Every structure is written in structure tokens, then in C-alpha cells.
Design a protein around this ligand. Structure first.
Ligand SMILES: OC[C@H]1O[C@H](O[C@H]2[C@H](O)[C@@H](O)[C@@H](OC[C@H]3O[C@@H](O)[C@H](O)[C@@H](O)[C@@H]3O)O[C@@H]2CO)[C@H](O)[C@@H](O)[C@@H]1O
Ligand SMILES: *[C@@H]1O[C@H](CO)[C@@H](O)[C@H](O)[C@H]1NC(C)=O
Ligand SMILES: *[C@@H]1O[C@H](CO)[C@@H](O)[C@H](O)[C@H]1NC(C)=O
Ligand SMILES: *[C@@H]1O[C@H](CO)[C@@H](O)[C@H](O)[C@H]1NC(C)=O
Ligand SMILES: *[C@@H]1O[C@H](CO)[C@@H](O)[C@H](O)[C@H]1NC(C)=O
Ligand SMILES: *[C@@H]1O[C@H](CO)[C@@H](O)[C@H](O)[C@H]1NC(C)=O
Ligand SMILES: *[C@@H]1O[C@H](CO)[C@@H](O)[C@H](O)[C@H]1NC(C)=O
Ligand SMILES: *[C@@H]1O[C@H](CO)[C@@H](O)[C@H](O)[C@H]1NC(C)=O
Ligand SMILES: *[C@@H]1O[C@H](CO)[C@@H](O)[C@H](O)[C@H]1NC(C)=O
Ligand SMILES: *[C@@H]1O[C@H](CO)[C@@H](O)[C@H](O)[C@H]1NC(C)=O
Ligand SMILES: *[C@@H]1O[C@H](CO)[C@@H](O)[C@H](O)[C@H]1NC(C)=O
Ligand SMILES: *[C@@H]1O[C@H](CO)[C@@H](O)[C@H](O)[C@H]1NC(C)=O
Ligand SMILES: *[C@@H]1O[C@H](CO)[C@@H](O)[C@H](O)[C@H]1NC(C)=O
Length: 549
């Protein structure tokens, strides 16, 4: 009979397919179709490797503009595409990646490179042995012959990326059990009525679902759980109306904003928002009442966000906290596609971020984020804590691997650790005016540890102390190489700042750097300014920056 995809669904492996897959790299796919990679084929086999059957794993594809050529102007203008595949596993598995029969043999580089998974080449394919880890893995498979240079940084990156998301099975807390109480499971196609349903749980089983580019998934106040099953592909954006103690989005399916134009405004017919009014549609949105709420986000893959990925509505955001795990953001070629907000008390871990704006937004206290892979594009710092002065304390970001960066100039506000200017007076984040800070606020006890920048990188830090800084520690940061000196994105700086109202000088105390390396060179106080390119620390703060050697 004609060849058909064969998927796995057992206790050791789960893969899926879509019968409405569409090979298309230039226009929007049909409402009920799923854009599929025409370059990469992926199959998976639980070890040990044998003549046993390999199971097909659907490879999704995201393209800049999502097929809407008139939206390309809102991207960085590169020609990169991003494909990805997800599967669940509970045992080591071999991932077999194939390219068409006419593709020549090419070695691959897996990022993060620290993974060091066994890789073998045979019969026009690449076999990667992925070990089972309870927190799974999110990595990039880069073919040497597919690498291109991105001007003007010269960054070497895949023209056609391929991401692999191997995740653990879903427990009873992230997967609705059979015939769950007061649940509703919409049929494939156009999804209607969820904004007025009396259901508590919304279940999206395998299949394709879509709102349209002129509607989104507004969930009624009774909905506290939306589940995206592995194999479910939902074109839309989520907004909880529930003010309950917990609102949850889980499952390993996909939530794609590909049908929305950039900056789509939900209050203006979903047309592009007028005058950068900040009302672009978020992929995750909630609204608070007068009681605490926890947003649990687990397993989901968000693709093609039309604007910032997430923001909650409310007068006091101290009432919201997040619990994020095994989550991915892909195909974010548009600008202002920020990572999630990490509200007070947040624990975020095992995440993959493809973003063209603020990545890790350190705006709230008592936050812990760890095990993150980031494909930074061309705008904003990897870590951001500028824009507005804040009282923020007790933050820990650990094990963050920025596998790629493609900045172009100083105006992009580049840098691993950054704090741009005051948005009220410098909306684009860059200005020589350093007198709009707040001397009554302080960012204290911050730890950024085990950060790694693969390939060419922007500056270690470009921080405007818009409020006082105290006890900020950088421990173990490796930069493979720096972007060209010429583009002004690699020199680190920290200019002296003053209070907006009384002119008091903003203070910086105990800002330490330990375990900083550039390529094969260890950075110390001796070569920090030269090899480390840390030549912009204001003399008033120089005595507060300590190199622990
Ligand atoms: O507050 C908005 C935004 O301001 C800054 O972004 C600026 C960039 O740093 C500049 O390089 C330049 O980039 C233009 C570029 O913006 C993309 O977002 C867009 O997708 C693309 O089509 C366009 O060519 O201008 C922007 C401001 O417009 C700041 O760095 C951001 O963090 C901030 O979100
Ligand atoms: C796997 O099998 C279970 C049990 O029948 C089913 O609920 C689920 O939808 C299947 N998943 C896929 C993607 O095959
Ligand atoms: C086959 O794969 C190569 C990359 O290995 C790609 O450049 C080529 O376009 C593909 N062939 C076609 C046109 O399908
Ligand atoms: C994509 O852009 C790169 C430079 O960034 C260029 O070398 C490559 O040829 C381009 N590919 C196509 C199909 O134009
Ligand atoms: C529910 O959403 C639909 C769009 O699907 C909208 O037309 C309708 O007005 C909404 N109902 C309410 C009560 O808001
Ligand atoms: C929160 O609002 C509810 C309903 O309006 C009310 O019953 C409750 O007393 C409020 N809680 C507080 C702390 O005021
Ligand atoms: C952070 O945690 C501390 C306790 O360690 C608490 O006192 C403080 O209020 C918390 N900050 C916020 C805004 O939640
Ligand atoms: C500082 O932050 C750490 C976590 O990074 C936390 O354990 C500790 O209690 C905080 N308090 C201080 C200032 O020591
Ligand atoms: C780098 O960019 C900053 C901000 O625009 C500017 O002040 C500085 O002079 C630039 N350095 C040069 C001359 O490359
Ligand atoms: C800096 O900006 C503030 C806010 O607009 C303004 O009041 C002040 O005069 C400016 N001073 C400088 C550095 O020119
Ligand atoms: C920094 O890296 C070294 C390995 O070279 C490790 O021993 C140390 O624990 C790391 N520091 C932190 C805070 O993780
Ligand atoms: C900081 O506090 C002083 C009073 O202690 C006040 O005059 C000043 O305006 C405050 N900083 C701000 C918000 O500009
Ligand atoms: C260190 O890196 C530089 C630049 O990549 C290279 O030229 C040099 O050979 C390297 N030295 C060592 C010890 O590997």
C-alpha cells in the first residue's frame, strides 16, 4: 500500500502526526492544515538501536511573516526558518534525522554543545542518542552545510533550523484523566463558545483547531485548565477570565499565533494596533481579582507570537505568580516577541526561548529560573531589568545557554545582562540622559550563574542603574567569541545615574564577576577592560565592580 506515517504510543515513547500537513514556505496554510517541514524528516526509536521500527515524529515549520508577505517588514529581514518536533519519552531514544535523497552528507553540531549526545552518520541520515532525563531536553541540530552568515554580525547560524523537544510523560497534574469532571472537548476546526462555557477544563485532543486571525481563545471565568494534548495543534491565543486560585495551561500540543498580524489589537478587530499602544495580542493573558492566583504553564509549545508572549491584567501584579516547566517558544520572527513575565515567587525551568526582544525579564522579586536554552535574535538583552526603576530582590537565574545571537548595532540594546533606559523618556531604550532614575529603589541580591553564550556574542553587560544596585553576582559566564568591534554591541558599560527629582546619585554596591571567560581566555581584573571588553564602567562605580579571581 502507499506509504503512511507510523507513530508510537506506548509507555516508553509517544510521537504524533497530522494528516493535514502542508508543505508551504511562502503563504498561509489552510485553516485546518499544519505547516510541515519539507526539508527535515524525523523518526524516533527507543533504544537499543536495532532493525526494529522507527516511529515518525511530525516536524512543524514556522516562517517569518507566517506566510503574510506584507508582514515581513515587521521582522528582522533575514531568510531563516525554524522547524521543530516534539515527542514524549521515558527511556533513552535514538532520533533519526533525514534530509532528501539529494542532500549531501554533512556533519551536525548540537546546541547546547554541553549535551554531548552520541551522534552517528549512516545511510544519508543522522542518528542522535538522546538519554532520558525527567526534565527532558530542548536542542538545536545544525547542519554544517546549512550554515549562513548573518550580516552585519557575521554570526554563523542554520538557515533552516531544526529543534528537538524531548519531554517526559504527562502526570495526572498536567493531563486530564479519562472523562474528567465538568470538562469540554471541542471538535477539530473552528472553536466557538469557550468564552461562555460553564466547563472547568477545556481539552484539545489530537487534531487541528483554529480561531481565526480575528478572534482568540477567551476562556470563561469558570475555566481553570486548558489542555493541549500531544498531537493537538491550536491556532489562537489564550486569555483566562478566571480569577481563581489557579489557572493552568498544560500538555505538549502547540498553541500558534500564526493567523494574527503583528501587533494584532483584540479591541480593534485584530488589526495592527495604532500608535504602538501596547495592546498587541498576548499568547498568554489572565486577569486578577482581589485574591492570589498561580499560573501553571507546563509542556506547551507556543509558536509565532504576534506580540509579547505574556502579560496579566491587574492593579497589583504581586497577586500573581508563575510555575513554568518544559515550555517552548518557537518561530518568533516578529519584533517585541518577549519571553514570559516571571511574577513574584515564580519558578521557571527547562524552557526554550526563540525571541526577538526582552528575553528573561527580571522585573519581580523571589524569582528562580533555571535550565534555559535561548536563541536570541537581533533586539534587546538576554536578561532585562531596565525600562522602569523597581524594588526587586532575591533572584536566581542559573544554567542559561544562549545558543545564538544576531545583533546589528548599539540601537538594538544588545547584551547578555542589560538594563535599558527609562521607557517614559526613552521609549526605544537608548539615551544619553541618565538623570531619570529613582534613588529610593533598589535591586538587591541577584545571582546570574552558569550562563553560556555560544558562537559570537554581544557585551557581557550594558546596565543603566535606573535605581540602586546592591549585591549582584555573576558566577560562571562563558562567551565563545565576540561580535565585531565595529558594530558597537560588545563593549560592556554602566554609566553613572541620577535621581529624576532630587539629583541624588544612584549607587552600585558589590557587583561581582567570577568565572568569566572569553573563548579560551580567563578574564580577570587585569584583562577585563581589554579582552573582556568591559571598558564602560563609570569611574564612580569602578570601585564597586569586583573581579573574584
Ligand atoms: O519599545 C519598543 C522597543 O524599542 C527598542 O527596539 C528598537 C530596536 O532596538 C532598534 O534596533 C529598532 O529596531 C527596528 C526593528 O524593531 C523590531 O522590533 C521590528 O520587528 C523590526 O521590523 C524593526 O526593523 O527600533 C526598535 C524600536 O522600534 C528596544 O530595544 C525594545 O526592547 C523595545 O521593545
Ligand atoms: C495515545 O493513546 C491514547 C490512548 O488511546 C490516546 O488517548 C492518545 O490520544 C494517543 N496519542 C496519540 C498522539 O497517538
Ligand atoms: C534537499 O535538501 C537540501 C538540503 O540538504 C536543500 O538545499 C534542497 O533544496 C532540498 N531539495 C529540494 C529542492 O527539495
Ligand atoms: C539567506 O541569507 C544568507 C545571508 O544571511 C545568504 O548567504 C543565503 O544565500 C540566503 N539564502 C537564500 C535562499 O537567499
Ligand atoms: C464570545 O466570543 C465571540 C467570538 O467567538 C464573540 O463574538 C462574543 O461576543 C463573545 N461573547 C461574550 C458574552 O463576550
Ligand atoms: C475579595 O472580594 C470578594 C468578592 O467581592 C469579597 O467577598 C472578599 O471579602 C474580598 N476580600 C478582601 C480581602 O477584601
Ligand atoms: C519575597 O520574599 C520575602 C521572604 O523571603 C518576602 O518578605 C517579600 O515580601 C517577597 N517579595 C514579594 C514582593 O513577594
Ligand atoms: C538572596 O537570594 C537567594 C537566592 O538567590 C536566597 O536564597 C536568599 O535567601 C536571599 N537573601 C539574601 C539577601 O541572602
Ligand atoms: C556606541 O553606541 C553608544 C550609544 O549610541 C554611543 O554613545 C557610543 O559613542 C558608540 N561608540 C562608538 C563610537 O562606536
Ligand atoms: C533628562 O530627561 C529628563 C526627563 O525628560 C528631563 O527633565 C531633563 O531635563 C533631562 N536632562 C538632560 C540630561 O538633558
Ligand atoms: C562555576 O563552575 C565551576 C566549574 O568549573 C563549579 O565548580 C562551580 O560550582 C560553579 N559555580 C556555581 C555558583 O555554580
Ligand atoms: C526619592 O525620595 C525623595 C524624598 O526622600 C523624593 O524627593 C524623590 O522625589 C524620590 N525620588 C523620585 C521618585 O524621584
Ligand atoms: C584560543 O583561541 C584562539 C582564537 O580562537 C586561537 O587562535 C588559539 O589557538 C586558542 N588557543 C588555545 C589554547 O586553544
Amino acid at each position: 500500500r502507499e506509504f503512511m506515517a507510523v507513530t508510537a504510543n506506548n509507555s516508553q515513547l509517544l510521537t504524533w502526526w497530522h494528516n493535514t500537513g502542508e508543505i508551504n514556505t511562502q503563504t498561509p496554510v489552510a485553516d485546518g492544515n499544519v505547516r510541515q517541514s519539507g526539508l527535515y524528516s524525523v523518526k524516533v526509536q527507543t533504544t537499543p538501536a536495532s532493525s526494529s521500527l522507527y516511529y515518525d515524529s511530525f516536524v512543524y515549520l514556522a516562517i517569518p511573516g507566517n506566510g503574510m508577505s506584507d508582514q515581513l517588514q515587521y521582522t528582522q529581514g533575514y531568510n531563516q526558518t525554524q522547524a521543530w518536533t516534539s515527542f514524549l519519552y521515558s527511556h533513552d531514544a535514538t532520533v533519526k534525522i533525514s534530509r532528501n535523497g539529494s542532500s549531501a552528507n554533512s556533519n551536525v553540531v548540537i546546541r547546547p554543545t554541553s549535551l554531548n549526545f552520541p551522534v552517528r552518520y549512516d545511510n544519508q541520515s543522522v542518528y542522535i542518542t538522546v538519554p532520558y532525563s525527567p526534565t527532558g531536553y530542548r536542542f538545536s541540530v545544525e547542519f554544517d552545510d546549512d550554515l549562513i552568515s548573518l550580516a552585519p554580525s557575521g554570526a554563523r547560524q542554520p538557515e533552516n533550523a531544526l529543534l528537538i523537544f524531548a519531554s517526559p510523560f504527562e502526570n495526572s497534574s498536567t493531563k486530564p484523566q479519562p472523562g474528567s469532571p465538568n470538562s469540554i472537548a471541542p471538535a477539530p476546526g473552528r472553536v466557538l463558545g469557550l468564552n461562555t462555557t460553564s466547563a472547568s477544563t477545556v481539552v484539545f485532543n489530537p487534531g487541528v483547531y483554529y480561531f481565526t486571525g480575528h478572534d482568540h481563545m477567551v476562556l470563561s471565568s469558570s475555566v481553570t485548565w486548558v489542555y493541549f494534548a500531544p498531537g493537538a495543534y491550536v491556532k489562537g491565543a489564550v486569555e483566562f477570565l478566571s480569577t481563581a486560585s489557579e489557572v493552568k495551561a498544560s500538555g505538549h500540543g502547540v498553541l500558534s499565533g500564526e493567523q494574527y498580524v503583528w501587533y494584532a489589537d483584540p479591541d480593534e478587530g485584530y488589526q495592527k494596533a495604532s500608535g504602538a499602544n501596547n495592546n498587541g495580542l498576548r499568547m498568554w493573558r489572565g486577569t486578577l481579582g482581589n485574591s492570589s492566583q498561580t499560573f501553571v504553564l507546563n509542556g506547551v509549545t507556543v509558536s509565532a507570537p504576534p506580540f509579547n508572549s505574556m502579560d496579566w491584567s491587574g492593579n497589583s501584579l504581586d497577586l500573581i505568580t508563575c510555575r513554568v516547566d518544559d515550555y517552548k517558544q518557537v518561530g518568533a520572527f516578529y519584533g517585541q516577541t518577549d519571553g514570559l513575565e516571571m511574577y513574584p515567587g515564580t519558578i521557571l525551568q527547562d524552557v526554550f526561548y526563540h525571541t526577538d526582544d526582552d528575553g528573561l525579564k527580571m522585573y519581580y522579586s523571589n524569582v528562580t529560573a533555571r535550565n534555559i536554552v535561548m536563541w536570541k535574535e537581533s533586539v534587546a538583552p538576554v536578561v532585562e531589568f531596565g525600562w522602569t526603576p523597581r524594588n526587586t530582590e532575591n533572584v536566581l537565574f542559573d544554567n542559561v545557554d544562549v545558543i545564538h545571537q544576531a545583533y546589528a548595532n548599539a540601537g538594538n540594546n544588545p547584551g547578555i545582562f542589560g538594563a535599558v533606559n527609562n521607557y517614559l523618556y526613552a521609549p526605544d531604550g537608548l539615551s544619553s540622559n541618565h538623570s531619570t532614575g529613582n534613588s529610593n529603589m533598589t535591586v538587591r541580591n541577584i545571582t546570574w550563574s552558569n550562563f553560556r553564550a555560544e558562537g559570537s556574542s554581544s557585551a557581557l553587560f550594558r546596565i543603566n542603574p535606573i535605581q540602586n544596585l546592591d549585591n549582584i553576582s555573576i558566577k560562571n559566564v562563558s562567551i565563545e567569541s565576540f561580535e565585531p568591534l565595529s558594530i558597537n554591541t560588545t563593549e560592556s558599560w554602566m554609566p553613572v545615574w541620577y535621581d529624576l527629582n532630587n539629583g541624588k546619585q544612584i549607587t552600585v554596591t558589590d557587583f561581582s564577576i567570577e568565572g568569566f571567560t572569553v573563548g579560551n581566555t580567563t578574564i580577570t581584573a587585569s584583562n577585563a577592560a581589554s579582552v573582556g571588553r568591559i571598558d564602560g564602567v563609570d569611574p564612580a562605580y569602578a570601585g564597586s565592580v569586583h573581579y573574584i579571581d
